[PDB]
Design a protein around this ligand. Structure first.
Ligand SMILES: *C(=O)[C@H]1N[C@](C)(CO)[C@](C)([C@H](Cc2ccccc2)NC(=O)[C@H](Cc2c[nH]c3ccccc23)NC(=O)[C@H](Cc2c[nH]c3ccccc23)NC(=O)CCCCC)O[C@@H]1C
Lengths: 233, 231, 204, 222, 212, 229, 202, 191, 231
């Protein structure tokens, strides 16, 4: 009967999928996740959703390694973000299995975004209320950072920010982001943006770095590493 | 709110009636059947001069002998045309004969009510005029979104359908010639449109008994009909 | 036969806190030598190596399905897969195809994460895993390796001695197997480094 | 009104308002009359005329060699029901080699429409049938309704103007049983006031079901 | 296990300018045993054509039932009975629809087209269609085919016009060919269903055949 | 049709069915968790509907596998569904990999199932929040999984009735260097604050993952000893 | 025996007409050239039912494409459609040996297609049991600059020699001459008439 | 089991294939291209049933094009080789592609991959599928120098193909040889 | 599976979901496709990109095939799905038919995807208008079809989609010529977009497919030269 159906995959008078717009709002009310693309790699830095003196910072709530060459930061619902992270990991491994090559970052982004968009356009199910900052490396586009939203729309960003106070982080990145940054410089910029738009415990970091011989490596900074990075700032 | 399959308290399928309205919003098309064949004349609504008129097609050759002209949603009419072409070629394959005009019209109409909810989501927003040659006899049918095909001798579908019917009521006769059928179709189209009728804004076609073929008129033939028109 | 279609010879061996896993380098199409650069031993992780003896087709299919599985497991669990856990993963992968088995026999040579103890896991094509403390053998040279290693293996072989028997005990087996050989490669996984020694076998 | 949204929703007075809306669709169809005799059955229908230059759309259909249906309501629904009826006839002939009975076809149509009303998303057939068939069970006339029920009639009138035809049939009801095929056709024509718009399908215990229109019907128009 | 019985029996079609004569033995026999002596293997399909079938009787009945249902569907959805050409194409398509589980039956579609002309179509089990003027099917097809070739010489000279015989000359050719096949084919006999499709329609005669 | 999500974003970017399921959790019986240095504890108020209830027949503190145990606050029946799913997932994990499902993997599976029911159509979210205790390489770990499928680790927690006051009480009374004994005492104390009337051993269930890495549900006798110690 | 060759004057497609099951000639008048499009035919070799059904289905698909799209369907396109349809039944024991011959925008084209999925473009093909004999005639007597009569006679004679030397080939040579101006059905010539009974060597 | 040969050089790959297609004992065509150019960089010589090699070639070329269009980047020679191997392994498990291939490629570096019907992927300096691998290997082995000039490579490929012609009983009427290098794939004539 | 009738006729005969998809297209960025006898030029306005946004490999322009360019206006993910289907279809047409898919055929396919979404229960319409352009063959005239969320498609001498479609279309009509050269078509598209872009060099991108060629992005230097020549 669809009496209580919300018509999730239905346009609104303005031509917007209301469920996708509300998912975007949910993201904008979530912890800030900033991505900064430096010379060889990308620094992702997210605000943990679940913090407090009684919370145990054992795992990255928002940072999720997708593959040896791709890491992600989450803004919004960490649950459906985890679902899409599982799908992204499976897609990267399927690409590796098919081609014996690490999935190009844009293809993994396209896959997760096609999942999101399939939820926005078919099935009458709510969209994934998560925005991903997918940092990655591939031989084609070098090191990349992609911002993906619940609509399934993604774009490459040298630097960007999502979540709470994402506009302030974006403005700070515009003011201070420079090309050809070093890993240290980009980490400092991300820490500065996070602090200016918001504590090491609450914050989590992940540096993708491409070395010529070692390849692309994802390193999600632990509590102690993030504490050291914050104290450096 | 209510399902697309809802019957109104009057007993009308609300979505079918709304699809008929969508047809009423479509380009005017007039089919005139004469003992010498049947003629489609459809308005091509050239919104811009950069619009390729040849690509804006209401007339579709379903088969060598039968064709259709659309009024309403061009894409839904395209789906109906695809079904009709598949069914005309399937009939040619299954029975080694051209599909009957009634047969292909009924085939496309059986798809009209196939919409549902809880298949298509909605009725077709296009009405068809299916004119063809079956066993050397010219047949013409009109189908509405309800899936109700009725054989016609002179029908009009689209923007000026009511006005075209009023004009044909005292302009169409059962013993006209092919030239007279062309003149009547083109005149009815001109009088039930909001633009001038030239070889570019009109698409003409004929299911001709003489050739037993549904041929869509070239620019020269449309120019000839336009020139011969008295006004 | 399809099991002998690609002649294979994989030989893991236990030393003193070190494993060896050696393989013949031949890719042969039955009696034809296609290549001498075929990789049958794959690093699963820093302390797990998988020598896949059998159909080069299934060698790559199972290596890449196991890489898929291990990469997913290490992404989800954020820790390297343990040699025992990878053995169970290989067993699951091979028995998932119980009714259409891979024509590959695995030989898992690893070091246990804590004690660095050698871990050998040899199985049949469908994941029936043995856990020899001395040596695991696989491939068309299976019986040859069994005999040579049963006589040759000694406890507490250091990486040098472990490599020496892996190489000798593999050379003897491949040089009796017509379809396997054409060079050998021995990965000696010790507690701190992996030594990949390409050994000269007969090329006939 | 609020209960008139689905064929699956009963009203507080135990009614399916969408079924009644499909019924009203049938009632707004062209007049259709059916008559039954001991040996012949007839369905005469004033075929709809959407325009003066449109041949009257057929409503008297040929289903089985001894079964014919007059569809009143949504023509496309009637055509889908006729495809279903052809499937049932084909399967009965396949299974048993004999022509299915019009009573069995009426039962299948009733079941199909009842299914269309017992599940959401699917809609009652806007068409109502007058199926006449002369088989082993004799001549039988059935009015199949959108709700998913059929009524066996000696005579019946459905669609618009049906009241006058129904009264005429009631007047001559007791005559019909023994009335000859020609007499039955004449009764159907009298009961069904519009000539060319009137088709008339007649079936008999011996004769197959055949449709007469205009000239073929002139001998009985009287 | 073969799902057929390869029953046998011979059918012989001869088309003429205004007729088609298909004579088929009615014997239903297999493995030196006669299941039936009068099993008509020629079927009036509609007012335009008839289908003679030889081969497995279960497949004959299945195919004839399917073709009768197809022709009934055509007559309902087209309001005119399927033409002999349309029935012939339907027979080809139906036989090919079981291309990989064939009706092990040889079909002769003999009818009258809209022009009043006798149209005969021969088929193989998988639905090859030959628009021919005479054909033979069944256990005695090899016996009868040279007989029709002699009667018409079409095989001898295939580009010469078909020397169409009188309806009674075609009936006599079919009768004589069936009698010869019966004398030499053990699976042909017990009766000849000699069906003739003309403008007048379907006319069936039964002629005794040797029952040995 | 069924497969339309009844959990959908509202105008404010909030899944209102998620908040409703969290409310169902907040009326679902106080459950506490406390991470010790050498283990973790999941206690919970298990006040039966009647004394005639047989406690062992429906226990909120449950074992998912040898190393992972689970308690819940919320709807008992869909907690049992989640628990069957988690035990099945850990058995599948053992079949595939020869070891019990890791604590974090059990938590991620519970979170995935809850998120699934938050997104698929025709279903409501699970009206339970799970406190899953189990060991990992780095030490004991208490985890909370919400009806939304969002999971996160805790040092101490309360989920059910009066869980805000219980969480404040844990903030005040929880310490990092607690032993399993002290974690059990802290969990019992938190239950006492979140429970009115005499808090006895039969009215609470305690599960513990201790130095042995194995999850065990303390019997009523052990709970009595802890209450009297 | 079917054959089709491109020469400077167009495509000559000559087919026999013998349908032979086992050693018995079931027909000598079977049509082994099927017109697919106004400028394109398909030849039949192999299973008669398979060849005729699948060339008929290719004709249906070509007509569907023609009505659906203004873009003309090339001979390459028709051959590819047929070979994909036949590969759809790979392992179903279909037996089609066909030549999709005809003129498209790019000129003359012959594609030998078979149930095995092969699709070989060429200027000269012969399929069927007598294909080797027709090849013996074609490869020897073929000239690019033949006349229409000479090319039709070349195809006719290749089929005739195949019929003489092949038991499975016989009947009448149906010769079609495809040009840019369409498929011309030259004639059906009884190979019995083509045999030179003055000659005694064969 | 048609003869396809491959010869990887320092910056090129000469990929030859039996150019003659036969219907049983009849050579239907003599210029049949069995080296399907999946890409401007990759030529896949195929050896097997003409109708399974054609279908596999069409699928692989369509998927390479789909990868190039869907993802702006092109597949690497290694990536394309592993995709082909994935296709062949899936098939052999389900419905084997009875096509043994030599994937020559140049994605900035020459690549030659032995690719049996099963899904045996092996980078090779030279190779062959069919029975010609029994005839050409030794030739290559005896005459392949590291760093061959393209003309020395053409002479070596001519040597191998003449070995096939002279010593292989089912000797191809001829070979279609393609050079896969930085300039793409070009049909070169070995003379 | 979800099969709600998302797209249904309104009482006035309009499919309001198609209207909302058109609104989504309008909120999409502007594309202009122009044709010269031997060239097709698609100029798309780059969305306002900060200094932090990578401007490469995110153009709205795409190649459905070596002969088919595509550009879109509307929801980027809807258009991504449409482009994926279109590329799969171009390869599928090559598989089924050796010939490359005609621009009419591929535009029909994409518009039929949009039509199916307007007809499929539980499927939202594609909020995307697609300018699908290319050459059927070497000798075929360049084609520029515009497919709308409704699933209707029409060929155009020059067309625009997205925001400012009115203004860009007016510019095209004022400045279109029957036999424009490659340079003239490039200038037409570039100026038509220049009228409604804050910056010429930055906000504007161009991709041209010449006859017998593939999609080709304009060089920034050559694009700037053309922009300055227009101004
Ligand atoms: C060149 O030299 C010619 N050779 C012959 C053999 C032609 O006669 C072929 C190859 C030819 C192709 C063909 C195409 C179109 C029409 C007719 C013929 N092949 C045949 O004639 C085949 C031979 C045959 C027998 N069994 C097989 C199996 C696989 C492939 C080929 C064959 N004959 C047939 O297909 C029969 C034709 C036919 C027509 N009327 C019949 C009545 C009774 C029996 C057979 C009849 N059909 C069958 O054999 C069907 C068997 C079904 C069993 C369930 O053409 C080239 C040009």
């Amino acid at each position: 009967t669809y009496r209580y159906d919300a018509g999730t995959t239905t346009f609104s008078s303005d031509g917007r999928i209301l469920q996708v717009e509300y998912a975007i709002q949910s993201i904008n009310q979530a912890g800030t996740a900033i991505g900064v693309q430096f010379t060889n790699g990308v620094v992702l830095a997210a605000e943990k959703k679940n913090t407090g003196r009684l919370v145990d910072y054992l795992f990255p709530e928002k940072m999720a390694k997708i593959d040896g060459h791709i890491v992600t930061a989450v803004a919004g619902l960490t649950a459906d973000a985890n679902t899409l992270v599982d799908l992204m990991r499976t897609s990267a491994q399927k690409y590796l299995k098919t081609y014996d090559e690490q999935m190009p970052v844009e293809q993994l982004v396209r896959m997760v975004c096609d999942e999101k968009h399939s939820y926005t356009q078919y099935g009458g199910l709510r969209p994934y209320g998560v925005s991903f900052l997918i940092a990655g490396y591939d031989r084609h586009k070098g090191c990349q950072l992609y911002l993906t939203d619940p609509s399934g729309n993604f774009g490459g960003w040298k630097a960007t920010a999502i979540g709470e106070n994402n506009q302030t982080a974006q403005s700070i990145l515009k003011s201070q982001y420079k090309d050809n940054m070093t890993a240290t410089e980009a980490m400092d910029l991300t820490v500065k943006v996070l602090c200016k738009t918001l504590s090491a415990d609450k914050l989590e970091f992940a540096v993708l770095q491409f070395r010529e011989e070692y390849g692309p490596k994802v390193r999600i900074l632990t509590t102690s590493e993030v504490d050291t990075l914050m104290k450096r700032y | 709110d209510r399902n697309v399959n809802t019957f109104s308290p009057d007993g009308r399928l609300l979505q079918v009636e709304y699809a008929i309205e969508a047809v009423k919003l479509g380009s005017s098309a007039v089919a005139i059947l004469c003992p010498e064949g049947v003629i489609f004349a459809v308005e091509k609504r050239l919104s811009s001069q950069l619009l390729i008129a040849s690509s804006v097609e209401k007339v579709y050759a379903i088969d060598d002998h039968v064709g259709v002209v659309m009024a309403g949603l061009a894409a839904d009419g395209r789906t109906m045309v695809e079904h009709m072409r598949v069914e005309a070629q399937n009939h040619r394959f299954s029975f080694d004969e051209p599909i009957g005009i009634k047969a292909v019209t009924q085939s496309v109409c059986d798809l009209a009510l196939a919409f549902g909810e809880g298949q298509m989501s909605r009725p077709f927003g296009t009405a068809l005029l299916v004119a063809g040659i079956e066993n050397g006899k010219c047949h013409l049918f009109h189908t509405d979104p309800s899936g109700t095909y009725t054989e016609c001798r002179a029908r009009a579908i689209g923007g000026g359908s009511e006005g075209a019917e009023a004009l044909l009521r005292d302009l169409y006769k059962d013993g006209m010639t092919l030239h007279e059928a062309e003149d009547l179709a083109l005149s009815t189209l001109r009088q039930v449109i909001q633009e001038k009728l030239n070889e570019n804004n009109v698409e003409v076609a004929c299911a001709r008994v003489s050739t037993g073929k549904f041929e869509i008129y070239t620019s020269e033939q449309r120019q000839e009909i336009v020139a011969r028109l008295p006004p | 036969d399809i099991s002998t279609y690609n002649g294979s010879c994989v030989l893991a061996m236990a030393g003193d806190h070190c494993v060896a896993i050696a393989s013949d380098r031949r890719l042969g199409v039955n009696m034809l030598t296609v290549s001498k650069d075929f990789k049958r031993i794959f690093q699963i992780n820093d302390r797990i190596y998988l020598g896949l003896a059998g159909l080069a087709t299934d060698v790559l299919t199972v290596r890449e399905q196991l890489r898929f599985d291990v990469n997913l497991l290490e992404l989800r669990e954020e820790r390297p897969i343990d040699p025992k856990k990878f053995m169970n993963l290989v067993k699951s992968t091979l028995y998932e195809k119980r009714f259409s088995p891979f024509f590959v026999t695995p030989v898992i040579a690893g070091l246990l994460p804590e004690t660095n103890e050698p871990y050998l896991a040899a199985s049949d094509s469908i994941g029936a895993f043995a856990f020899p403390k001395d040596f695991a053998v696989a491939g068309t040279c299976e019986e040859s390796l069994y005999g040579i290693c049963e006589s040759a293996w000694r406890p507490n072989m250091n990486p040098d001695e472990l490599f020496e028997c892996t190489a000798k005990c593999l050379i003897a087996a491949v040089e009796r197997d017509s379809i396997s050989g054409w060079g050998g490669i021995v990965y000696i996984i010790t507690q701190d480094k992996v030594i990949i020694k390409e050994i000269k076998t007969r090329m006939d | 009104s609020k209960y008139d949204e689905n064929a699956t929703t009963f009203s507080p007075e135990g009614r399916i308002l969408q079924v009644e809306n499909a019924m009203k669709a049938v009632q707004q169809g062209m007049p259709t009359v059916g008559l039954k005799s001991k040996t012949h059955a007839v369905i005469a229908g004033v075929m709809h005329s959407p325009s003066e230059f449109s041949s009257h759309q057929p409503k008297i259909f040929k289903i089985d060699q001894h079964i014919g249906v007059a569809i009143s309501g949504l023509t496309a629904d009637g055509r889908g029901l006729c495809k279903f009826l052809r499937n049932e006839c084909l399967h009965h002939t396949f299974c048993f080699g004999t022509e299915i009975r019009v009573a069995d076809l009426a039962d299948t149509v009733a079941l199909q429409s009842q299914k269309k009303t017992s599940k959401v998303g699917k809609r009652p057939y806007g068409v109502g049938l007058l199926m006449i068939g002369a088989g082993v069970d004799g001549p039988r006339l059935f009015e199949t309704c959108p709700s998913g029920q059929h009524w066996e009639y000696n005579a019946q009138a459905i669609g618009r103007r049906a009241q006058a035809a129904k009264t005429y049939l009631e007047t001559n009801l007791n005559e019909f049983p023994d009335c000859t095929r020609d007499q039955l056709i004449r009764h159907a024509l009298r009961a069904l006031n519009d000539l060319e718009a009137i088709a008339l399908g007649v079936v008999g215990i011996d004769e197959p079901f055949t449709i007469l229109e205009g000239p073929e019907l002139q001998k009985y128009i009287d | 296990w073969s799902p057929y019985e390869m029953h046998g029996g011979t059918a012989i079609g001869i088309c003429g300018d205004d007729y088609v004569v298909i004579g088929a033995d009615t014997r239903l026999s297999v493995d030196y045993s006669i299941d039936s002596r009068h099993k008509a293997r020629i079927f009036k399909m509609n007012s335009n054509c008839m289908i003679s079938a030889t081969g497995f009787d279960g497949d004959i009945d299945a195919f004839i039932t399917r073709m009768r249902s197809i022709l009934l569907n055509y007559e309902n959805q087209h309001f005119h009975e399927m033409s002999v050409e349309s029935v012939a194409r339907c027979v080809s398509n139906t036989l090919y629809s079981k291309r990989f589980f064939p009706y092990y039956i040889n079909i002769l579609v003999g009818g009258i087209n809209s022009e009043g002309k006798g149209k005969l179509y021969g088929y193989d089990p998988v639905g090859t269609i030959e628009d021919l003027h005479y054909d033979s099917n069944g256990s005695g097809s090899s016996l009868a085919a040279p007989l029709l070739d002699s009667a018409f010489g079409t095989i001898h000279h295939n580009t010469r016009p078909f020397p169409a015989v009188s309806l009674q000359d075609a009936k006599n050719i079919v009768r004589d060919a069936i009698c010869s096949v019966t004398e030499r084919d053990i699976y042909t006999g017990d009766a000849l269903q000699l069906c003739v499709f003309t403008k007048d329609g379907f006319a069936q005669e039964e002629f005794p055949l040797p029952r040995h | 049709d069924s497969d339309f999500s009844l959990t959908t974003f509202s105008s404010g970017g909030k899944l209102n069915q998620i908040e409703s399921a969290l409310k169902a959790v907040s009326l679902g019986g106080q459950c506490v968790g406390v991470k010790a240095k050498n283990g973790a504890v999941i206690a919970c108020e298990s006040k039966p509907s009647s004394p005639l209830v047989e406690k062992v027949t429906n226990l909120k503190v449950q074992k998912i596998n040898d190393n992972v145990g689970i308690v819940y606050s919320g709807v008992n029946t869909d907690f049992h569904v989640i628990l069957k799913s988690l035990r099945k997932a850990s058995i599948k994990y053992s079949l595939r990999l020869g070891v019990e499902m890791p604590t974090r993997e059990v938590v991620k599976h519970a979170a995935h199932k809850m998120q699934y029911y938050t997104q698929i159509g025709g279903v409501r979210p699970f009206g339970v929040s799970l406190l899953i205790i189990g060991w990992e390489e780095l030490g004991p770990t208490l985890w909370q999984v919400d009806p939304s499928g969002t999971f996160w680790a805790w040092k101490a927690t309360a989920l059910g009735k009066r869980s805000d006051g219980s969480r404040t009480f844990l903030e005040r009374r929880y310490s990092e260097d607690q032993s399993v004994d002290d974690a059990i005492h802290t969990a019992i104390s938190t239950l006492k604050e979140g429970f009115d009337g005499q808090l006895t051993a039969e009215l609470i269930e305690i599960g513990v993952v201790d130095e042995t890495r194995k999850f065990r549900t303390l019997s009523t006798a052990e709970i009595r000893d802890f209450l009297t110690e | 025996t079917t054959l089709s060759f491109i020469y400077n004057g167009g495509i000559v497609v000559a087919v026999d007409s013998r349908a032979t099951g086992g050693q018995f000639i079931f027909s000598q008048t079977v049509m082994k050239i099927l017109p697919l499009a106004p400028n394109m035919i398909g030849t039949m070799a192999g299973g008669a039912a398979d060849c005729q059904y699948w060339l008929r289905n290719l004709s249906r698909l070509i007509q569907l494409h023609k009505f659906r799209y203004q873009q003309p369907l090339t001979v390459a396109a028709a051959s590819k459609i047929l070979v994909n349809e036949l590969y759809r039944y790979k392992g179903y024991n279909l037996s089609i040996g066909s030549m999709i011959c005809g003129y498209d925008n790019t000129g003359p084209h012959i594609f030998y297609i078979d149930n095995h999925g092969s699709r070989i473009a060429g200027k000269r093909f012969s399929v069927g049991s007598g294909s080797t004999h027709a090849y013996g005639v074609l490869d020897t007597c073929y000239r690019e600059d033949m006349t229409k009569e000479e090319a039709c006679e070349l195809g006719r004679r290749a089929i005739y020699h195949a019929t003489y030397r092949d038991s499975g080939s016989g009947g009448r040579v149906s010769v079609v001459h495809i040009t840019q101006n369409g498929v011309e059905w030259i004639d059906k010539t009884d190979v019995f008439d083509m045999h030179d009974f003055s000659k005694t060597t064969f | 089991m048609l003869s396809i040969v491959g010869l990887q050089g320092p910056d090129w790959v000469l990929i030859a294939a039996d150019s003659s297609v036969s219907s049983s004992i009849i050579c239907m065509s003599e210029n049949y291209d069995r080296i399907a150019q999946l890409d401007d960089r990759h030529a896949l010589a195929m050896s097997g049933e003409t109708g399974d090699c054609l279908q596999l070639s069409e699928y692989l070329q369509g998927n390479v094009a789909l990868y190039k269009f869907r993802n702006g980047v092109e597949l690497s020679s290694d990536a394309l080789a592993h995709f082909i191997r994935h296709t062949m392994a899936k098939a052999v498990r389900k419905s084997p592609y009875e096509v043994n291939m030599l994937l020559s490629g140049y994605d900035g570096k020459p690549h030659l991959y032995f690719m049996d019907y099963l899904g045996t992927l092996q980078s090779i300096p030279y190779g062959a599928q069919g029975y010609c691998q029994y005839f050409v290997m030794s030739v290559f082995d005896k005459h392949y120098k590291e760093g061959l000039t393209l003309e020395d490579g053409k002479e070596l490929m001519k040597l191998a193909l003449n070995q096939i012609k002279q010593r292989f009983t089912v000797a191809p009427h001829g070979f279609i040889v393609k050079l896969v290098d930085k300039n793409g794939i070009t049909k070169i004539d070995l003379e | 599976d979800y099969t709600r009738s998302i797209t249904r006729f309104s009482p006035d005969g309009r499919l309001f979901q198609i209207d909302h998809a058109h609104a989504a297209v309008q909120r999409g960025t502007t594309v202009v496709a122009t044709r010269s006898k031997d060239m097709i030029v698609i100029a798309v306005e780059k969305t306002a990109v900060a200094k932090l946004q990578d401007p490469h490999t995110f153009s709205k322009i795409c190649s459905l095939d070596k002969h088919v360019m595509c550009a879109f206006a509307g929801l980027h993910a809807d258009a991504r799905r449409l482009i994926q289907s279109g590329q799969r279809q171009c390869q599928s047409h090559r598989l089924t038919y050796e010939d490359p898919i005609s621009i009419e055929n591929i535009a029909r396919y994409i518009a039929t995807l949009q039509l199916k979404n307007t007809q499929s229960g539980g499927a939202r319409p594609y909020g995307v208008s697609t300018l699908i352009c290319g050459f059927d063959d070497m000798t075929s005239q360049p084609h520029i079809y515009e497919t709308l969320p409704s699933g209707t498609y029409a060929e155009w001498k020059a067309r625009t989609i997205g925001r400012h479609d009115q203004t860009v279309m007016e510019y095209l009509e004022k400045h279109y010529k029957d036999d424009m050269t490659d340079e003239e078509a490039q200038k037409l598209a570039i100026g038509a977009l220049l009228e409604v872009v804050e910056n010429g060099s930055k906000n504007l991108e161009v991709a041209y497919m010449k006859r017998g060629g593939t999609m080709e992005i304009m060089a920034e230097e050559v694009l700037d030269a053309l922009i300055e020549s227009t101004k």
